Every structure is written in structure tokens, then in C-alpha cells.
Amino acid sequence: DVKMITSLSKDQQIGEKIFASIAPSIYGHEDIKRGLALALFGGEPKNPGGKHKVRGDINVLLCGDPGTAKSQFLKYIEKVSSRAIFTTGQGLTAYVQRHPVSREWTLEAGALVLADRGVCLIDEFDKMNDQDRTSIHEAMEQQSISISKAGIVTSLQARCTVIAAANPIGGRYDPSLTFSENVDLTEPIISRFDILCVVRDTVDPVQDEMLARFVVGSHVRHHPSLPQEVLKKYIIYAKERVHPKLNQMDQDKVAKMYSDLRKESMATGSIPITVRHIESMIRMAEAHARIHLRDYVIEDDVNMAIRVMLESFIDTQKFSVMRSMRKTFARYLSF
Amino acid sequence: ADEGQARKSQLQRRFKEFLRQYRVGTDRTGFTFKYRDELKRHYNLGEYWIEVEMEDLASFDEDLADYLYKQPAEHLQLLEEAAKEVADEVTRPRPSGEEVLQDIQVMLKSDASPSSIRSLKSDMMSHLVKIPGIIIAASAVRAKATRISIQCRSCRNTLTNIAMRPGLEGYALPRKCNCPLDPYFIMPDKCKCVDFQTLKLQELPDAVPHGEMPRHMQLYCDRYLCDKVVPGNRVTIMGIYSIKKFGVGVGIRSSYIRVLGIQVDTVSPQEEEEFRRLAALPNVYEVISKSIAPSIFGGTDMKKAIACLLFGGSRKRLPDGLTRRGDINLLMLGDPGTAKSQLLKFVEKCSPIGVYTSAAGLTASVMRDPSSRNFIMEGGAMVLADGGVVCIDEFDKMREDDRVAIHEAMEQQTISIAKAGITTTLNSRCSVLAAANFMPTILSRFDMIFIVKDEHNEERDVMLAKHVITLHVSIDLAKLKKFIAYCRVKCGPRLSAEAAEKLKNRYIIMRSGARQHERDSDRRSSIPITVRQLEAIVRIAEALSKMKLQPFATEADVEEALRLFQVSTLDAALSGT
Ligand SMILES: [Zn+2]
């Protein structure tokens, strides 16, 4: 069963071959394909020896103007993943309920305890209510809920990765302001997300045909007159038989970047890469231990980790800063 | 029928020869009669219970410890009736005031692998089981008639000495007086009673098959097992899985576990000295404040202050009964960058009593109960923390009413709600460690403000590169707590005459310029000194000089505390303008 997976992982170039296996229909977005693939397998939930409880869950937050297949990105991840659940934001915690059969006032499970090990697909993130907002943040940095309800005082477990998509205000994302303005979300919540992908639109002529032809053809072969087999068994296998290790040769390969970029960002109207970004980068370090079975930290996927952790930060920036920081780093990082 | 009592009179004789003969220890050292001695030493103290161990019973007579696993109901009786005939030939002659022999509740423990609630299949009905869990509830103790006596109503015929069966099963009063149909009533004057509780046991968290809410079971404690465990404990129950007999489906019964063995999972003269010498050593101050925040580094003042809140000042009662505070409050202003949640978790973990809150609320509420249809009172966190410490984050998220009430609670140190049908008072005695992200008055309810700051020089960036791996990689608390537990309770510090004239001249000159500060600029908001802040200074110096078991504080720490405060007030000075 593995004997194939051995050489298939030893291709040394499984990255490209797996990226275009998720998002099977939707054309383009090989950018966000990368991030979501990073999220799917996950990372490594190491337990720090200083009693600090770092988490091993990658949470994503899409955003972009209406009509760009965000919801489809949610629905396909409903299928490909395992033990997944789903919800809209327009039930998040366990609540007292009168049983249909037994006629006793029991307690029923919510929507963040049914993903206690898998994924939680939130939709219409903006439409959440104040109680829902004050309840969602607790589970991010603690991953554990208490219920002192009418039923009884309990404290249960919730270890889920959150995959949600918000909307742009004014019916269109406009990149003059920062992303923290068009999202319409409380500020300490966006920090609880690792990746911040920003979806947009395009009127380029040569891609109009490329996308049209694809949709039209997908409407030609659906009506009554890496495939979906390798990667499902692969997310089952590669979830289990790896335990990525952590050496200390990369420990100084990054600080040389931070010392520069912190000044580069603070110089202008922005807050540089902070520790809650280094944590995301170091989490996505192992995100490729699951694809390659590599499990050893190398100066190769650190070029990838830093690249991604800046990819999800240059976009959420100002008008001329999203390009000034590019002219500096996108040419500096030697992409 | 006639062989029944003839077997029993031969079991109650082999259960008696076990207590009377079982020894331990080898032949080289010397022996020890294990259960006679405990019977005597527990009777003479007035306890009346032994703790028989099942391995011993097995190793002495192998058949008995099997019956006890199969028919525990009708054999525990013989065991507890032999424990009473052995405790008679051991303690007698009882001296003067007691000459009636009591009854010995024989508990029993074991060393065997535990089952789990999900493994209680109905073939285990009336077999000793052994399950772990967590207590989740506790009823109030009640009476339970054991030896009851009835009387007729019309002809006044008595039929006494009737014995109830143990567990949750009643009794069927006759109807054939030998007078109307059921002429029998209970005589309340003649009925021996024993206590009984009723707990509720939830299954351990790491054994739920993870799709649902954990299942729980119901217990039934007895005479000496009552008031032995508190909701929140870990236990290991040895009970007789059985059924209620108070006589969805046609033949369904209820089920409980009659507990007859209980366990719990987890100061010294020589330990006192490691507190003594540590309080006496010259650099006693920094040694603690260094080992109270290993992960987070930078600006030990925000860790210097937290050292005092763990000790606190002292509670004084003037002649007027006008008591004084004995706790402190702290505010850590600044952006939420998750650097502070770690600190909250630490201070909560290393505290004698402590709760970290983001349910019912913080202060008390008045809620319309579904059952009563009326309003009831819900004391929140600050009434459960007795002397402990409460940690709070996002000081603008808490409910408007709740924030008002926490303001008043830090003001007066008690919560008194006068609403629909509720007029009570709850003493709030805890410590507030708040983290911010605001009136000049809720701000002034505290005494110490710490806001966050940083730089960006490339040597500063070398400090940052240092701090990178200090987190990339990832005096003990286990004795720090047991040190505080003895330090708080043995020191009575007050101020010495010189600290008085130090503080007077510091505070007067702190006031003396606020005038010319606010008379000209008056930027619609500022923060001046108040006597509440002065009292805060005094109760800080007390907590400093309590680190050293030093019953009299001096100028040794007043000036550094005043400079700490020159930091903590200038912070809010910069923030409020
Ligand atoms: Zn009669």
C-alpha cells in the first residue's frame, strides 16, 4: 500500500503535482491553492517544554469581491477532508435541547466540538453575532470551551482548524486602505489567523478565453446525456506515519531577515512581522513534512516558510507600501 | 433456608479469623498484626472504620475473596458483622462513658486495573466494579433509616426492630395487623438513622470516543464516606453496580453504584528552613522575580510588580471596625499581542487560588429561573475567589452591567444586589490582574498602569534576534506556592516611623506640582495623585517587606516602590493625554 507512495513521495517534485489536484474545477489561484494545501495536512502540534502550549492548527481567512468561487473552495474542502463539518455565519457551542424521543432536557453538541480533531468550515464570517464573536476567539488561543449552562458546568475540548471567508465592504475590495478596513472584523481576531489570502478580479483578455472555455466545457459534459484516489488515501497515510523533527540550523537563518524587515515596516505606516507571524511560519515549516515525508527541517523549506509568511503580509498593506515593500523584499528574498 | 444460616455461621467465622490472624512483615525483622491494631487504634479514637485490602483477603483464604467479587451484597454484611465481634474482644473493657458496642463500617480498597463507565455491560449487575472518574455534583447529606420500628393505629400493636436493607430500596409495610387495611405507621421516636449523600461521577476526559458529551453515573455514599470529596476531584470508586428498587420502555430500571471504597488522586519542620534561609539571603528580592516568567522576557518591572500581588499587604481593623484592603490591582495596558496571555496563564497557575476569565458572569446576576419562574441570584467568579487572584483580558469586552458591577466590587470589596426578590451581600476577596488594549475613574480604580513600548535600532534588532530563538526553542513553582502559603500566614508587617516621613514628603511633592500642571493645560483629562494611591503604596511596601519575613519595613524598599510607581503613573499619564 505504501510501496508506491515511497517513490511517489521520492519524486522530489510532488509539490506542483499535488497543488493542481485540489481546486479541481476552479481555474487560476495557484497562489491560494498553495496556502490551502499547506493548511489541509496541517503542521506539527509540538508541545513546548516551558508550559506555553503552542498550537498546531493552521487557520485561513479568505476575502474578496463577490463572484470568485470562495464558497466553492469551502465546499470542496468539505469533501476532500475527513471528519469535517460546515456552518454559515448568518449553534457554535453546546446548548440545552429537549430531546425528540426521550423528552428530557439534555445538552447537545454545537459546531466547534464536532471538529474536535478535523476542520471547521465557517461561512459568512461577517454575519456573526456579538456572542458568537466573543465565543469564537476563546477557542483560537485556548482550544477549550467551558459550559456553565442550565444543564451543568463542564469543560470540554475543541481542537479544530478554522477555514472561513469574509466579504469586502462596499461590495468591492479596494486596496487603497489596509486589509484591516475592508474586512469589517475585530482587530484581535485577524491576529488569530495564520494566512490572510486576498481574492480579487481580472479583465485580462488572454485569460478570459482560458476561463470561459473551461466553464463552458464543464457545462458540456455534466448532464444526463492526481485523481481523487491518491490524495484521499494520502491524507490518510501522511497524517499518520510522520513526526517531523526540529534541528537548530535554521534558528539563525531567519533573524537576519527580521532585524531588517522590522525596521523596513515600522519606518512607514505599518506594523512589521511580529511573533504571531513567526509562529505561523514555524508552523508551516512542518506543513511540507506531510507532503514530502521529509520531517527534517532544512534551509530549503525555510525559503518556503519565510516566502509564504511574507506572501500573506505584503498583500494586507497600503497602496504604495504594498509595492514599496515589494520593490524591497520581492527582489530581496530572491523568490 | 436452614442451610442458609448454617453457611453464614461458617462464613462469619472465616471472615472473623481473617481479621484476627493476618500479619505482615518477615521473620528476620519482626511482625505486625495489621487489622487488630487498626481496629483498636480507630475505635479508641472514635472513628469506627477499617480499610480492608482485597489482595490480603485473597492471599489468606482464596475462596472468600471470590465470593466478595461475585455476591458482594450478602457478604459485606458478614464481613461487617465480624468486624464488630473482633472490635469487641480487642477494646474491652471500655472505660466508663461507653459500654455499647458501635458498628464498624468496613470500607475496602484494592490494587487492580480500573474499568470504565463505557464498559459497564449489564452482565456486571451486582458485581464489585472499580471505575475512575471526576466528581461533578454533590447532594446535601440526608438521613436514612436503618433499624425502624412500626406501630398499629387502632389496636396499638407494635412490631419493632425491623431492619431496612442498604442502598436505595424502601420497605413494604404490612396490611394484616393481627383493624383496618393498612393500620401501620412509623414511630419517629424509635428509628436509628445514618447519613447519606449522593454524588455524580463523570468519565475522565481522555476516554470519550470523541463524538459527543461524556456520560456519567450516579453514586450513593454512606456513613463515613459522606463529605469526603468536593466537586472537581479525581477519584477511584469501588462499588456494587446495582438497581433502584422503589417498586421509554416496558421493563426499564434505573441503576447506580453503591460506593463502598473511595480514593483521591493528588508543611514540615525541615521544609520551613528552605523558606527561612531564602527569606534571609541578601538578594532575596530578584531571585523570585526572575523565576516567575521564564518564557516571556523583557522589562522585569512588569514582573517585579507581579511578585507583590502574590503576597499582598495585611488586613487591619482600626478600633472603628473600619477594615482596610489586603490586596492589590494591576493593569497591563497595551496592544493585544498575545505576549500577555502567557503571563495571565502563569500567574493563574502559580497562585494559591486563582481564576482566569475572558458564562454566568463575573459579578452576581439575577436570572429568571425556568422552574421557579422567579429571579434567583448567581454569584459569579469574584465571590468564589476567596483571597485568590482573578485575571482578566480585553477590559472593553465585558458586559456593560458586568463592568459597572466589577467597578463597584473593586471599590467596596463586596457585591450587594437589591433587585426583584434578591437582597443579599457577597464578600469579594480576590485580586484583579487586568490586561487592557476608559473613564479616568475606572482607570483610577487601579493603582499601577503598565503600557507596552519598543524601538528599532540594529543593536535593538540584535536584542530582537536574541528574543527570536528564546521563543523558537519552545526556585520552582511547586515549592513557590507552598512557600507563599506559609509566608502569607506568618508575617504581620507594618511601617516604621521613618517610612512615614519618607512617604509624606514624597506624596506632598507629588501633589504640589499637579496644580500648576492642571491649572494651565487642563487637557480635558489627566491623572493626579489621590490618597487611595498612597494607601496602595503602603500596601505595596508591606508585600515587599513580607518577602523577607521582616516584621518591620523601612527605607529599604519605599524609594524603589515609589520609582516603580513613577513608571506606573507616567504610563497612564502618556496614555490619557
Ligand atoms: Zn391493630
Q: What DSSP line would sit under B245-267, residue for residue?
A: B----SS---EEEEE----B---
The verdict on B452 touching A (C-beta cutoff 8 Å) is no
B446 vs B305: CA distance, rounded Å: 13
Cα-based angle A311, A312, A313 (whole degrees, multiple of 5): 90
Please check whether residue B535 is in contact with residue B521, taking contact to mean a CB–CB distance below 8 angstroms: no
In chain B, the residue whose alpha carbon lies closest to the alpha carbon of A139 is B358
Question: Between A70-80 and A30-41, two packed helices, what is the crossing angle to 10 degrees?
Answer: 30
Chain B CB contacts of A129 below 8 Å: none
How far is residue A210 CA from its own chain's centroid?
A: 27
Question: Given an 8 Å threshold on Cβ–Cβ distance, is B336 in contact with A49?
Answer: no
Closest CA to A304 of A334, A261, A273: A334
Who among B295, B336, B461 is closest to A50 (CB)? B295
Chain A CB contacts of B473 below 8 Å: 251
Name the pairing type of β-strands A161-165 and A60-62.
parallel
Please check whether residue A99 is in contact with residue A59, taking contact to mean a CB–CB distance below 8 angstroms: no
Which residues 134-163 on chain B approach chain A with CB closer than 8 angstroms?
136-137
Question: Given an 8 Å threshold on Cβ–Cβ distance, is B359 in contact with A148?
Answer: yes
Who among B214, B456, B471 is closest to A275 (CB)? B471
Which residues 410-449 on chain B approach chain A with CB closer than 8 angstroms?
437
A330 vs A306: CA distance, rounded Å: 12
Q: Where are the alpha helices (DSSP H) in chain A?
A: 2-9, 14-19, 30-41, 70-80, 130-141, 179-182, 187-190, 205-218, 230-240, 255-266, 275-285, 289-292, 301-314, 321-325, 331-332
Method underlying the structure: cryo-EM
Who among A147, A188, A259 is closest to B465 (CB)? A259
In chain A, the residue whose alpha carbon lies closest to the alpha carbon of B437 is A188
Please check whether residue B240 is in contact with residue B260, taking contact to mean a CB–CB distance below 8 angstroms: yes
Q: Which of A275, A279, A302, A306 to mutate to test the interface with B (most CBs of B within 10 A)?
A: A275
Which run of H or of E encompasses B477? helix B477-487
Is the preceding peptide bond at B352 cis, omega within 30 degrees of 0?
Answer: no
**Cα B164 to middle of ligand 1, angstroms:** 22
Q: What is the distance in angstroms between the CA of the first residue and the CA of the last residue of chain B?
A: 94
Closest CA of chain B from A78, distance in Å: 18
Give A107's strand partners: A96
Residues 6+ apart with CB under 8 A from A200: A64, A65, A68, A173
Q: Which of A52, A261, A286 to mutate to test the interface with B (most CBs of B within 10 A)?
A: A52
Q: By CB neighbour count within 10 A (0-12 exposed, 13-18 middle, 19+ buried), where does A147 fall?
A: buried
The verdict on B522 touching A (C-beta cutoff 8 Å) is no
Write the DSSP symbol of residue B205: G
**What proportions of chain A, in percent to the nearest 5, are helix, strand and coil?**
45, 10, 45
Q: What is the distance in angstroms between the CA of the first residue and the CA of the last residue of chain A?
A: 37
B236 vs B258: CA distance, rounded Å: 13
B148 vs B164: CA distance, rounded Å: 7
Q: By CB neighbour count within 10 A (0-12 exposed, 13-18 middle, 19+ buried), where does B305 fall?
A: buried
The verdict on B368 touching A (C-beta cutoff 8 Å) is no
B64 vs B70: CA distance, rounded Å: 10
CATH number where B293 lies: 3.40.50.300
Give A147's strand partners: A154
Chain B CB contacts of A117 below 8 Å: 210
Closest CA to B34 of B14, B55, B13: B55
Who among A49, A116, A262 is closest to B474 (CB)? A49
Binding site residue list of B: 324
Which run of H or of E encompasses B81? helix B73-86
Closest CA of chain A from B460, distance in Å: 9
A312 vs B334: CA distance, rounded Å: 25
A113 vs A92: CA distance, rounded Å: 8
Residues 6+ apart with CB under 8 A from A162: A57, A59, A60, A119, A120, A122, A136, A140, A193
Residues 6+ apart with CB under 8 A from B356: B344, B345, B348, B390, B391
Residues belonging to chain B = 577
Please check whether residue A78 is in contact with residue A115, taking contact to mean a CB–CB distance below 8 angstroms: no
Name the pairing type of β-strands B142-152 and B255-259.
unpaired
Question: Given an 8 Å threshold on Cβ–Cβ distance, is B472 in contact with A141?
Answer: no
Who among B213, B294, B349 is closest to A50 (CB)? B294
Give A5's strand partners: none
- Report helix, strand or coil for B240: strand
Question: Given an 8 Å threshold on Cβ–Cβ distance, is B205 in contact with A157?
Answer: yes
Full residue range of the structural domain in which residue B283 is found: 270-576
Who among A51, A252, A262 is closest to B464 (CB)? A262
Closest CA of chain A from B295, distance in Å: 7
Residues 6+ apart with CB under 8 A from B510: B529
Closest CA to B46 of B94, B93, B79: B94
Please check whether residue B149 is in contact with residue B189, taking contact to mean a CB–CB distance below 8 angstroms: no
Residues 6+ apart with CB under 8 A from B6: none
Closest CA of chain A from B135, distance in Å: 11
The verdict on B370 touching A (C-beta cutoff 8 Å) is yes
Give the resolution to one decimal, in Å. Answer: 6.8
Question: Given an 8 Å threshold on Cβ–Cβ distance, is A278 in contact with B472?
Answer: yes
Name residue, grid cell 491553492. A33
Cα torsion at B551, B557, B559, B563 (round to 10°)? -130
Write the DSSP symbol of residue A329: I
Binding site residue list of A for ADP: 71-72
